[PDB]
Structure formats: structure tokens, C-alpha cells
């Protein structure tokens, strides 16, 4: 009974972080199973394993997208790493508003159950990741699957709003003594900025899908063509959510990568104020462009010109950040452990994804490339590579800390290499097919495109091997009979650390602080 109290009831931001990590792992495995099913269906032209029922294929793509874009990265960046390492790192006791922390995390699993039951009811939700109105209308679906999915989005959105309020008030109020705002590390800063984006944008998505719900069931005419109310309204609202949504899946990745590079280069982050201001500007300019996702729908020329300019301007600060990271490796005394491997892979593959994004940002190029696998390659590199590789880097770097044990090194490097090779083979032919011109979200393709989709299908199985290796790593870590040392790892042994969280204990005791840190603050 004491263990169920300690888990289902306790506030204890560290324990909520552990629960978030477990949920993130489960959701990730579910999403990868959906991805493998998609790849199995698309391996060869014709009906491969679905044997018809392209409706089920559309359901599969929708469920995969939701599972990994809402239940894998967000519960791992914000809930996973945020909950744990915001108050420990900032130098504070247990987080502000602990009950909000607990309610957000325990809201998530019912949202998962809603999403699966939406994929399971009478026929399914074959409407894509971005639920568009007329297809999700009651004339064309009439199931209830879309209702269940919309409520899933409501629960996830409410949970993330609660978490965002938690993090904003904690950073603004719950800091230590003497610690000015410009001494909180970049992980804390990225979590602050991403929490502001999550607080401001997400309610618009809630309004848009509430409006879709009352269009379906309670028989309004917001997105019914007869009576005004064009679907362009829903496109505008959902994407005004959508782009702040995608500059949230990567900002905690940026923070973690900055920390990893800083701790591996023997030197702190070059151009600290540059990093901070660039990240704030990315947050701000994530809002001023939202229709660069709908160039081919019929906006006038001036809006297209403006959104082109806005996407270029949002491209600049990421360049400042990447060049700053390259600079803060010019010092020396690097050491190629697995977190450094994954940070380096993050930087390289995110560079590739960002350049493709620039290619896509123009108007005419988006006219030619809208809804083709060029876009799929763009956001699979960016999102998958960036977010997931930052996730793995953080996971190694701080499983040095959570459980108290340490992974075996050869298996860590083996997993990095397997996953890198597989997931970089399986997504570049997407670029080539998108240039050729195949439309996105199709179960069958003309015979011409069958050349590469056999090769890309060869890439998913390598990534499955990589994930299985990763779980072998996690189990051998949780049963490794050899605790944290100096020969194994040189991080936690530091008697002097740039970040506060390495000089505490193997796991934090229960309050993470017998007594709060101080700051000398000279010039008496």
C-alpha cells in the first residue's frame, strides 16, 4: 500500500519525471510499431498486408502521428527531463505547484486510451494527423472516431497547459538565492521559452477542435460551405497552433545539446547571451508565421510573400545557435562518449533537415512540393533526428543520474551507429520521391516509384534492431551490478561543475537539497 501511495499519489517532481519517462518509452514503442506496419504496407506496390482497407491505412498513419508527436516527445522533453531537471538544475527544492504536476501526468494516460479507442471504434479516423474539417465532417465519417480523437487532443492539451503554467511560475518564482535570471542554465531557459509557446498556442488548438466538434455533432456550420464558414478558417486556426507546436518539440532538444556540448568541451557555452536571445527570438517568430503550411490553397500574393520572408527570418536564429555550438567546441579536451555522439549526430542531421526546410519555405517551390514525400523527408529528419537524438543523448547523459547505474559503453555506441545508419537510410529516398512527385499519404503508388520504396523499407528494420538494442541497454543498466565510478564516467565525480545537478548525489535523496546553494556576490 505504501508503494501505491508513493506512485499514484506522491507529488515529488522526480517521481513524476520517472513516470513520464516510462510513459514516453511505452508510447514510443507503440508509435514505432505503427511506423513498421506502415512501412510493411508500403514495401511493394499492391496490397501487402492490409489486403485492402485503405481506410485502415489512413487510421494507421493518423495514430502513428498522434502517438509520436504528442505522447513520445512531449512527455519526454517537458514531463521527462523538464520535471526532473528544472528544479534540481536551477537550485530549488520541489517544484512549484506539485499537484498540477501530478494531475497533468495522470491526465495523459486517459488521453492515450481515448486515442486508441478512437482508432478502434466502428471504422476509424482516417483523416490524417491534421484533422481537416470536411473529411472529418459528419457526412463523410459518421462514426464517432473523430469525436474520440478530438477529446484525446483536448485532454493532452489541458495537461500540457497545466504543465506549462507550472514551469513558468517555477522559473519566475522558485529560483535560488542570488541567482539572477542570466545565471540559469540553457536547459532551464529552453524549458521556459517552450513553456511560453505551449501556454500561448495550445488553447487556439483547443478552440479549433472544439469548433470542429460542435460542427460535427451539435450541427453548427463553422466549416460547412453552405452558410459561409470556409474550411480555410480551420486551416488558419490549426496551423496557428501547428507551427508553435513544432518549435516546441525541438527547443528542449536545443537545451540538452547545449549542456552536453558544454560538459564535453571542458568549457561553457560560447556566446551565452547570443544563445539566450536567439532562442527567445525563435520563440517569438514561431508565431508570426503559420500559413507557410498552406501555400497551395488560394491565398493572395502578398500573404505568400510575407510568409516567405517570415520563414527566412525564423531561419536566421537557428543558424546563430548552430554556429555558437560549433564555436564552443573550438576549445579542446573533447571526449567521444555516447552523449557526444548523439549531440554531434543531432547537429549534423538537424542541419540537413533545416536546409531542406529552407528549400520548402519559398512559395513556388512549395507549389511544386506541397504534400509530397519531400515534406515527409523534411520533417522526419528535423523532428525525428533532432528530437529523438537529443532525447537519447539526454537519456544516456542522465541515466548516469536517475537510476544510479551506468550503461555499457560498447552497447551504447553500437546502438548509436545502428540507429543512425538505419534512420538515415530510410528517409533520404523520401527526398528523392518527393522530387519525383509522388503524393503523400497513399497506400499504393504507381509502378515508377517502386524502386526506392523497396530500399526505404529496408531502413525500418535496422531501426527496429536499434530500438531493441536500446531496450537491452536499459535492462542491463537497471541490473548492472557496478555502480557509478570515476573509471566508468568522469561527470559526476567533479568537485566543481558548471551545472549544479552533477554535484549532489547518485540519485537525489528525497528533497534534492538538505540546504539551498548560495552565491558569493562580491562588491560589498
Amino acid at each position: 500500500m505504501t508503494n501505491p501511495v508513493r506512485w499514484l499519489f506522491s507529488t515529488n517532481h522526480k517521481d513524476i519525471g520517472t513516470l513520464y519517462f516510462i510513459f514516453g518509452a511505452i508510447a514510443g514503442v507503440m508509435g514505432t510499431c505503427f511506423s513498421v506496419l506502415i512501412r510493411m504496407e508500403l514495401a511493394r506496390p499492391g496490397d501487402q498486408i492490409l489486403g485492402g482497407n485503405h481506410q485502415l491505412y489512413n487510421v494507421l498513419i493518423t495514430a502513428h502521428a498522434f502517438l509520436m508527436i504528442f505522447f513520445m516527445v512531449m512527455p519526454a522533453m517537458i514531463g521527462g527531463f523538464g520535471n526532473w531537471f528544472v528544479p534540481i538544475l536551477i537550485g530549488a527544492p520541489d517544484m512549484a505547484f506539485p499537484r498540477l504536476n501530478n494531475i497533468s501526468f495522470w491526465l495523459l494516460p486517459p488521453s492515450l486510451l481515448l486515442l486508441l479507442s478512437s482508432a478502434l471504434v466502428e471504422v476509424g479516423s482516417g483523416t490524417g494527423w491534421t484533422v481537416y474539417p470536411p473529411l472529418s465532417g459528419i457526412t463523410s465519417h459518421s462514426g464517432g472516431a473523430v469525436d474520440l480523437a478530438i477529446f484525446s487532443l483536448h485532454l493532452s492539451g489541458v495537461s500540457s497547459i497545466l504543465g506549462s503554467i507550472n514551469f513558468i511560475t517555477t522559473i519566475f518564482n522558485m529560483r535560488g538565492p542570488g541567482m539572477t535570471m542570466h545565471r540559469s542554465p540553457l536547459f532551464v531557459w529552453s524549458v521556459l521559452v517552450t513553456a511560453f509557446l505551449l501556454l500561448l498556442s495550445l488553447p487556439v488548438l483547443a478552440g479549433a477542435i472544439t469548433m470542429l466538434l460542435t460542427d460535427r455533432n451539435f450541427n453548427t456550420t463553422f466549416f460547412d460551405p453552405a452558410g459561409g464558414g470556409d474550411p480555410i478558417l480551420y486551416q488558419h486556426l490549426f496551423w496557428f497552433f501547428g507551427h508553435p507546436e513544432v518549435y516546441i518539440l525541438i527547443l528542449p532538444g536545443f537545451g540538452i545539446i547545449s549542456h552536453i556540448v558544454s560538459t564535453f568541451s571542458g568549457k561553457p557555452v560560447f556566446g551565452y547571451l547570443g544563445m539566450v536571445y536567439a532562442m527567445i527570438s525563435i520563440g517569438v517568430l514561431g508565431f508570426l508565421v503559420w500559413a507557410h503550411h498552406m501555400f497551395t490553397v488560394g491565398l493572395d500574393v502578398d500573404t505568400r510573400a510575407y510568409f516567405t520572408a517570415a520563414t527566412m527570418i525564423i531561419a536566421v536564429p537557428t543558424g546563430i545557435k548552430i554556429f555558437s555550438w560549433i564555436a564552443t567546441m573550438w576549445g579542446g579536451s573533447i571526449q567521444y562518449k555516447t552523449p557526444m555522439l548523439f549531440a554531434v549526430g543531432f547537429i549534423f542531421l538537424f542541419t540537413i533537415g533545416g536546409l531542406t526546410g529552407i528549400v520548402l519555405a519559398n512559395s513556388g517551390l512549395d507549389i511544386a512540393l506541397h504534400d509530397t514525400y519531400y515534406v515527409v523527408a523534411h520533417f522526419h529528419y528535423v523532428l525525428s533526428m533532432g528530437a529523438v537524438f537529443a532525447l537519447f543523448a539526454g537519456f544516456y547523459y542522465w541515466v548516469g543520474k536517475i537510476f544510479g547505474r551506468t550503461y555499457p559503453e560498447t552497447l551504447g555506441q553500437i546502438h548509436f551507429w545502428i540507429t543512425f545508419f538505419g534512420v538515415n537510410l530510410t528517409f533520404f529516398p523520401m527526398h528523392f520521391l518527393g522530387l519525383s512527385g509522388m503524393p503523400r499519404r497513399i497506400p499504393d503508388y504507381p509502378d515508377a516509384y517502386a524502386g526506392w520504396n523497396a530500399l526505404s523499407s529496408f531502413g525500418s528494420y535496422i531501426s527496429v534492431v536499434g530500438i531493441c538494442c536500446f531496450f537491452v541497454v536499459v535492462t542491463i543498466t537497471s541490473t548492472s551490478g557496478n555502480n557509478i565510478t570515476r573509471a566508468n564516467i568522469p561527470w559526476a565525480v567533479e568537485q566543481n561543475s558548471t551545472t549544479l545537478e552533477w554535484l549532489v548525489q547518485s540519485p537525489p535523496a528525497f528533497h534534492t537539497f538538505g540546504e539551498l546553494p548560495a552565491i558569493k556576490e562580491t562588491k560589498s
Binding site: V29, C33, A63, L116, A119, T475
Partner: protein, 47 residues
Amino acid sequence: YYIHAKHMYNLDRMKHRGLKMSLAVFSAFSIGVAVPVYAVIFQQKKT
């Protein structure tokens, strides 16, 4: 209880910890790769 413990987890103590963690991770993987397959199996079991 272990609020007043030197380590929040103190994972070493439990009974050999090996079978327990192995089953834990394997059941996590089973729940991760069972429901997604089961949804497709049920949909084909339907019309």
C-alpha cells in the same frame, strides 16, 4: 518509508532485482508492440 534515505531509489536492495527488471522491460515492450498490432487484428476481425 524512504523520505529520509540517502538515496531516493536505493535500487540495490530488492530481491536480486534481475528477474524483476527483466520482466518489467519485457512487459513494457510487450505492451508497446501488442496493442498496435491488436488494433489492426481487430479491424480485420471486423467487416
